[PDB]
Structure formats: C-alpha cells, structure tokens
C-alpha cells in the first residue's frame, strides 16, 4: 500500500 516504497 506504500505507492512510493523508497519513501520508506
């Protein structure tokens, strides 16, 4: 559900 995973 991230959408922009690297932002995590």
């Amino acid at each position: 559900e991230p959408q922009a995973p690297w932002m995590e």
Partner: antibody, heavy 116, light 112 residues
Framework: VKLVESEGGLVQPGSSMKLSCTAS????????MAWVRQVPEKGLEWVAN????????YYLDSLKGRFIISRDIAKNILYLQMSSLRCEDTATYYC??????????WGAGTTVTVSS | DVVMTQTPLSLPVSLGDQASISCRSS???????????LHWYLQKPGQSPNLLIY???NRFSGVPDRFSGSGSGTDFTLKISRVEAEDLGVYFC????????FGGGTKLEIKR
C-alpha cells in the same frame, strides 16, 4: 486513461518555466503522480513525485529544490515548476501516474530546451 | 545510489523465436515490506514508455502471456516468447525499492 503535457519549448539558461499535465479518466486524487525525464545519449531519470493530496513529495536530490511538483485537485492538473535552469535540464519530460511503485500511465512527453 | 545494469545492449531475434533480457541491480530490491519493486517498460519507436511487467512477474493489463518476467534479489530476466515484429523497441527495467532508477535499456531488433 491519458495524461497530456503542456507545450515545453525553449528557455534561457538561468530562467524559469512551468510544465503542466492534464489527467482524464480516473479519480485523480486516488493516485500518486510523477515526472520523469529522458535525454538522448541518454537514459531515463526520475524527477519527482507527489502523493494523493500533495502533502508529501519526493525530488531527485541533485535538483537542489529548484523543481516543485504540485497538483490542482479541483482542475485535475499536475505541475512541475522549474527554476534557474541549466543546459543539463534539457530533456523530454513525461507526466506519469504512479501506482504501487510503478508508472502505469505515461503522457506523450514534452521537450524542454535550455539555451541562450 | 542503486545501479541497474541491463544485458545485452542490443538483441537481434527471428520472428517466432524467444528473446531473453537480463537486468541486475547493485543492491537487493527486496523492500523491508517484503515486495520487490522491479518493473519492465517498453518504449516503441516514436512513443512513450509503457508498462509491461510490474513487481517482477505481473503482466500489466493488455500484455500477452508471451511476455514473462522472473528473478529475485538482484537478478532479473524478461523473456519474450514467439517474438512478433511489433515487439521491437527499447526495453527498460526500473527499480523503485530505493530512490528510483532505470536501466539503460535493451534494444530488441527483429531479424529479416
């Protein structure tokens, strides 16, 4: 479907410009959005992205905050403000829809040329 | 800074034969959340890239079963079975597990 970028074109070094991208066919604020750019000789480079409501953004670090990605949810529009342009910013810019880490809809691309 | 290295730079193939394209990453693409954000795009001549395969092996809507993605960790492969002329163009891998980056592309050439 469909994402349509504004006309790009010529900009003088050191000057500023704003691209827009108009989206149709989906619940706009239901999807993240992104900008990617392509040079010849060559290679694709991720430029920026923005979450559903615009409260969180990501930028390619080397841009040093010169670019701003934003979205008008009331007009279904995505913007890329570009400031203090150098020749290295010359490229084809693509608007894209971002879902679960991948770009599942791309625009036609618009070229930006930074030249005196 | 994760580097995506694609092999070969250009790939000639006969119609009906299979093409295999390699994409390696310089760091594991397994995210902490368990997903591998490795994707494949095709850019046909005079066109924008379009999504082919997402998250290693998932075909995007409209992509035929001829296109198959596989691999894990740092090593990935795109296989195109029974190549048709309209398959030609540049195939790019991309990762978004980390700060997102793209491979340099592999050009599929059709033999005649």
């Amino acid at each position: 479907v469909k994402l349509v970028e504004s006309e790009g074109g010529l900009v003088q070094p050191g000057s500023s410009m704003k691209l827009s991208c108009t989206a149709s066919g989906f619940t706009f604020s239901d999807y993240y959005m992104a900008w990617v750019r392509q040079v010849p000789e060559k290679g694709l480079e991720w430029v920026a992205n923005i979450n559903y409501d615009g409260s969180s953004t990501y930028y390619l670090d080397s841009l040093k905050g010169r670019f701003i990605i934003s979205r008008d949810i009331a007009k279904n529009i995505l913007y890329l403000q570009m400031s203090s342009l150098r020749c290295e910013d010359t490229a084809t810019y693509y608007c894209a829809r971002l879902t679960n880490g991948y770009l599942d809809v791309w625009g036609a691309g618009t070229t930006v040329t930074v030249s005196s | 800074d994760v580097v995506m290295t694609q092999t070969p730079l250009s790939l000639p193939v006969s119609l009906g034969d299979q093409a295999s394209i390699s994409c390696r990453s310089s760091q594991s693409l397994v995210h902490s959340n368990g997903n591998t954000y490795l994707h494949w795009y095709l850019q046909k001549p005079g066109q924008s890239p379009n999504l082919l395969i997402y998250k290693v092996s998932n075909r995007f809507s409209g992509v035929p079963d001829r296109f198959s993605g596989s691999g894990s960790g740092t090593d990935f492969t795109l296989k195109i079975s029974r190549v048709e002329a309209e398959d030609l163009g540049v195939y790019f891998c991309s990762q978004s597990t980390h700060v997102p980056t793209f491979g340099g592309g592999t050009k599929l050439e059709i033999k005649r």
